Design a protein around this ligand. Structure first.
Ligand SMILES: CNC(=O)c1scc2c1OCCO2
Length: 115
């Protein structure tokens, strides 16, 4: 509360570390369904069903232009990519399995870097 704070955490490397995690995500061989925004003109139902589309290129653009105020907002956008994937794809599908793999890959890098 006012004048009552936990010891200050060094957050100066957070931007660089999220950038590194994102690069690792982008170069994973199962990243291909998440690299670019889903084409809303060529994929029927996607625009109506998925209220908040998200992809790795949009996260990269947001990160590089100072649009993430903190760690949690970056993590929420990464998780949104995989939550969207789960909403639109059967678990028993290549993209469905890609999403599960990429979420596990992210969460391990997230805990190891910041916990
Ligand atoms: C995360 N990606 C997806 O949910 C979907 S839905 C239809 C697609 C596609 O990604 C690749 C191309 O076509």
């Amino acid at each position: 509360s006012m004048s009552v704070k936990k010891p200050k955490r060094d957050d100066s490397k957070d931007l660089a570390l999220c950038s590194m995690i994102l690069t690792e995500m982008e170069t994973h061989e199962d990243a291909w369904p998440f690299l670019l925004p889903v084409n809303l003109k060529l994929v029927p139902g996607y625009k109506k069903v998925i209220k908040k589309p998200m992809d790795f290129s949009t996260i990269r653009e947001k990160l590089s232009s100072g649009q993430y105020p903190n760690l949690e907002t970056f993590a929420l956008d990464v998780r949104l990519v995989f939550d969207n994937c789960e909403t639109f794809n059967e678990d028993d599908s290549d993209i469905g399995r890609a999403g599960h793999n990429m979420r596990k890959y992210f969460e391990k890098k997230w805990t190891d870097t910041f916990k």
